Enzyme design. Structure first.
Site, PDB file in Angstrom:
ATOM      1  N   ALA A  64       0.870  -1.238   0.034  1.00 20.70           N
ATOM      2  CA  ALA A  64       0.056  -0.170   0.146  1.00 20.70           C
ATOM      3  C   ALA A  64       0.972   1.163  -0.065  1.00 20.70           C
ATOM      4  O   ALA A  64       1.923   1.140   0.073  1.00 20.70           O
ATOM      5  CB  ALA A  64      -0.955   0.072   1.188  1.00 20.70           C
ATOM      6  N   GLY A 107      -2.324  -5.184   1.663  1.00 16.44           N
ATOM      7  CA  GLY A 107      -3.665  -4.906   1.167  1.00 16.44           C
ATOM      8  C   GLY A 107      -4.062  -5.663  -0.083  1.00 16.44           C
ATOM      9  O   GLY A 107      -5.209  -6.068  -0.332  1.00 16.44           O
ATOM     10  N   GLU A 110      -5.227  -9.054   0.940  1.00 19.04           N
ATOM     11  CA  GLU A 110      -6.616  -8.656   1.256  1.00 19.04           C
ATOM     12  C   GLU A 110      -7.756  -8.625   0.210  1.00 19.04           C
ATOM     13  O   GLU A 110      -8.845  -9.005   0.371  1.00 19.04           O
ATOM     14  CB  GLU A 110      -6.562  -7.597   2.515  1.00 19.04           C
ATOM     15  CG  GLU A 110      -5.702  -8.139   3.696  1.00 19.04           C
ATOM     16  CD  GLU A 110      -5.497  -7.078   4.377  1.00 19.04           C
ATOM     17  OE1 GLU A 110      -4.621  -6.173   4.197  1.00 19.04           O
ATOM     18  OE2 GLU A 110      -6.202  -6.878   5.686  1.00 19.04           O
ATOM     19  N   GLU A 130       2.539  -6.063   7.340  1.00 21.98           N
ATOM     20  CA  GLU A 130       2.559  -4.786   7.895  1.00 21.98           C
ATOM     21  C   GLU A 130       2.674  -4.710   9.333  1.00 21.98           C
ATOM     22  O   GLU A 130       2.592  -3.428   9.810  1.00 21.98           O
ATOM     23  CB  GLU A 130       1.344  -3.892   7.493  1.00 21.98           C
ATOM     24  CG  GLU A 130       1.237  -3.977   5.876  1.00 21.98           C
ATOM     25  CD  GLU A 130       2.291  -3.614   4.930  1.00 21.98           C
ATOM     26  OE1 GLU A 130       3.417  -3.071   5.442  1.00 21.98           O
ATOM     27  OE2 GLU A 130       1.953  -3.527   3.677  1.00 21.98           O
TER      28      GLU A 130
END
Ligand SMILES: [Ca+2]
Ligand SMILES: [Ca+2]
Ligand SMILES: [Ca+2]
Ligand SMILES: [Ca+2]
Ligand SMILES: [Ca+2]
Ligand SMILES: [Ca+2]
Lengths: 255, 256, 256, 256, 256, 255
Positions: A64, A107, A110, A130
């Site tokens: 990200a 991300g 995800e 992260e």
């Protein structure tokens, strides 16, 4: 006109391709808004029966944009409800297929897990790194990874930030199928075509039923499925489906 | 000075070693009390960021002391709330790592499953055999095994008492990683070191979020995670972690 | 007298064999009523401790009869509660084992998933292909498949209708064990014998506990299991099972 | 420009007034779209801290338009997801207050139940009479009514279609407070003013916490609330609110 | 020797009396630690069958010590797990009775709600006012208040900070019984005596069963209760209780 | 031919009356089996749209036969799954109405709570006194009482064995309506008539929807209700219902 993605339609398949190659398709707020807007538009289009999300051969989505988060206070994040808009993707009623090559990290992991079907290239690398940046998953990784691969492996990935290759992901529950990197898009398109040529309502109801398996007790999921099942016989496509089978021909659903 | 365990501290890693070699580390009431006491003490120590639980190369823990249970009535068990104290280990906020070699059977398997991360030697052997003694699992095996490996395999193990080797355990969902037996303690300590060097706040939050995946609907788990994620932005370690990444330097976490 | 199944008893094992070779053991309302009736009768027989459900070498069950489904409307389906009677099989307290050879497709896959243990021949093929007919799972497939093998694979199977071979089924969570086709019935009988020679009370309690893993939070499941475990200390088989272990002899169970 | 509602702003209070006097404020798809659009716009306005929804002295909302419902089939209802858009109102983060005078029947009762606070005129009449038309609740009535007033009364209302007066509604769990009809709008404005002058962060967090009470086990709700409470200590309004209390002065909130 | 509470034992009744008269029994960290410590000690005493918690005629507990919270950061609160220790009172197995006179506000209301039975003086005043200090409930009020009195009233109380008198509390679901203020302690002790003279096993089981009503689906709660009921038939008190009833004599319970 | 109950049919209403007057309608295994058998038979009868369960003016059902439980071991109770058969009553799909006069104590209280609608005479006395006999509720009282009246009052009743009068029960959530003792049966019959003249499928679906409110999260209950709602428009009775309303006449449903 999108700045961070590309959208194409081919028959009843929509394809969203992340397009930030210099940043390894890293997610930012713009990508979130564009991906969710396109997916929602495709979801409301009666000529689309399946949606593919994909990136590049090097990266589906590698992490990200950290500058967009670095200076946030709790108040900032709570007021924005930071990342909540990604919920629009899980809300899409039409089947979604993540076609994942290379890095699908943080991300990006995800985002892949939010889709219904996940076809991985043998080059796919999954991770939730992260914790190294002093935060935990914020796009559902702690919930979906754990439900997919079990506690032991989810804790390992989330606490250490280690990567998981395609083979481990496939034997652990994270991916539907692994294919050669060169065949990823062809295979994803094939699967999307198959799903898109099902009855739109039947495929939506089937997806809805499967999604209930994470929201209630088995007893309640079983009841929900049965009632849905009964309702599928209030539709025209069921009768066409059964005719086609008897006549050993392809069905021509009206959706 | 514990009787049934050994406790060691190095840097930010605590290690609890089961130590009943005469009984292949079979669990009894004293082991439960000492392991939970030690883990709780380590959990409250700000200089510890990860806790390892392990046994010997022969056995993580091979079942339980049956003499302690043989004569119990329902009233005895209900009054004692027999085994409830093991809940204190699940309540530990700091990440826990089970380093499993050899036998992890019955209570031993259940103990391994209580931990967050499970690193298994290629020698590891898992089972829930106490159906053969006329009882079912009593330390959460029917719940955690089933959630890890699925109904068909959990039912098979629990109703037949058959063992499961490390390879099957790893492809079925029970273990994080399998390593060669000679490397188990080295690998476990390397993993624990890695986890202990993360932000203590971030690691506690990540663990807590993962644990919610078994306690509510996905919809509720997602909201919980997102709100905990928002909270992280009130921490010094979120600021430093992201600043360090942007500035291409090593983070200096303070654990707040 | 059954028209669609055969029922055998061997010591403490009951075996229900689907017997519609002309339709590759396709399920229908008659098979539903007969299988559930037979299973319930076996469940209430104190001389039975395990129940096997099986088909032929070519097919466990290839699907469901189409004829019955095209015949009715929604108000009719709702009033009949079409397929609800299969719930009687889930309500069986005695352990159940699906011995699956060849095709277990649609309703056949769903039937196998209703059983506690699932032993598969290496020839077994699983799937939910009825989406191709515009027809949804109505026997719990969207629920049990997803909980066994995870979202990605369950969505793949249910939305595309593709099959899953025995090896994939085993590494994904769907089956307990894979054995050679020629050995399926022998292996299933051996597993059933083993389970049926356990304490009937312990086996029933263990199964019940495992089933709780899909019906509530982990916290509630743990409490349920611990209390059932406590109750086991009121049973004769707990006393005998543990005494036999301590005295180094085979336990002599009374199923009380 | 709205066709079916009026929208007013007074300091930190937004007021949505249903405006279909010709149909006793009957709901339809247009009212659904306009109310949810207005509420969402108010929700995103940082200068609004509370939202009132209200109708006329004769009717909050007397039901839903029949015309729209007879028009479609099931596949059409499923594809449109008829009534799903009302979910946007539940998703409003700012506190909502239903000020109910006269008839709140069917969809009208359901709309009032979607709000956080419900202030009723002594003239208010509640009910779910659509069973008389062979029509079920589709706006959450079977869920929110039952959770408010209990099974016995909810079954009575929903199966018989009988009305419930303000006093019964108040003693049963459905309404926050009952006030004289002539004072309803004054009392609702006063309540909304009070809520809107609270910390926006504290009010939003409190509402969110209360809503969790219907979505998970008590154990999970308690944990969620405690963590949200912990996060509140990262807010300026927590600091100012508590400082003001200790220093015996009125708090000066910044909604941060 | 506690600082903030008084503890008395008579027959099988323990009484914890909050004792910060200078602060109208406002809760602080020390009260939390002492009340939980005392309750846990009484819970483990086999000669105690019921525990009363009460304050003064002026106040059960009027809020909290705000100076202890005013300067906390999120990190401070998260690290301390601020308020989590109150969970020890919920974990008490012996029945607890809150005897509430005068103010039960904020934490005081939440403390009253943690108990099983709540007997209120006609003078009792309930509220959750800490929205006025810029925070939400942190001791379970958003969860227990809402479950007791319903969404509309809970939202009203929590968002406005308004008080609720004993009459409204009793008709809304929050309190067991209302008695005249002069009779509160007499009535509470009479109720506690009645409960303490029941089988300790039966009372513990009954309480545990009631508590499940908030933790899972009705279907799961019903199974839990039925199984706990079956277990009761392994207790001496079940045999004696029923024998005494049949034989028209007073039961002699042994608490096993 | 039942030994412990009486069953009558009047139009679309079935009425089960407990008939052990000398024992104050105390429940035993025979009553359980007969009540559940009759209710299930009535449930499968297409000419019945509502089922009433009632006792006498002195007692709906005052407790249970204690001799049938006094000598039970855990093994006995677990093997029998003692009281499980009462689940057949909750499984009845047709609306059930408990018409409760006088004592409804222990098992009798639990029987009343298993029904959908509860009409109480002003003489109704509710209780769960079997803690006095060294056991807890075993027919769902700890679950249904608590959900009806809240924790504080449920704990009070279950731990002390105290009785709750009709007025307290009505303001606390336990009963639908309180009527004068002399009007109980007339009022129960009136309510049963009303419900029985609704569409059979609509009344069943409405009952089913309400029952979901105790089995899952609000989010899942809302979804279930909406899907059920959509399905009600696949039925003929909906169109008749709307015609009757427009023409200001009584509907003639075919069920
Ligand atoms: Ca696997
Ligand atoms: Ca920050
Ligand atoms: Ca024993
Ligand atoms: Ca602060
Ligand atoms: Ca009330
Ligand atoms: Ca007994």
């Amino acid at each position: 006109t999108y700045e961070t993605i590309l959208v194409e339609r081919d028959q009843r398949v929509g394809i969203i391709t992340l397009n930030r190659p210099q940043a390894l398709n890293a997610l930012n707020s713009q990508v979130m808004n564009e991906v969710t807007s396109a997916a929602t538009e495709l979801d409301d289009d009666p000529d689309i029966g399946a949606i593919i999300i994909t990136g590049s051969a090097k990266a589906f989505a590698a992490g990200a944009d950290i500058k967009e988060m670095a200076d946030l206070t709790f108040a900032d994040a709570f007021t924005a409800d930071f990342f909540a808009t990604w919920g629009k993707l899980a809300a899409v009623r039409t089947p979604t297929i993540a076609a994942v090559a290379g890095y699908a990290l943080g991300g990006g992991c995800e985002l892949a897990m939010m889709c219904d079907v996940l076809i991985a290239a043998d080059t796919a690398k999954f991770g939730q790194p992260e914790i190294k940046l002093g935060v935990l998953p914020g796009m559902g990784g702690s919930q979906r990874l754990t439900r997919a691969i079990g506690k032991a492996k989810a804790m390992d990935l989330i606490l250490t930030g280690r990567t998981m290759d395609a083979a481990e992901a496939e034997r652990s529950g994270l991916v539907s199928r692994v294919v050669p990197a060169d065949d990823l898009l062809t295979e994803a398109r094939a699967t999307a075509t198959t799903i898109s040529q099902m009855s739109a309502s039947a495929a939506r109801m089937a997806k809805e039923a499967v999604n209930r398996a994470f929201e209630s007790s088995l007893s309640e999921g079983l009841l929900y499925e049965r009632r849905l099942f009964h309702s599928a016989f209030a539709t025209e496509d069921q009768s066409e489906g059964m005719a086609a089978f008897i006549e050993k021909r392809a069905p021509q659903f009206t959706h």
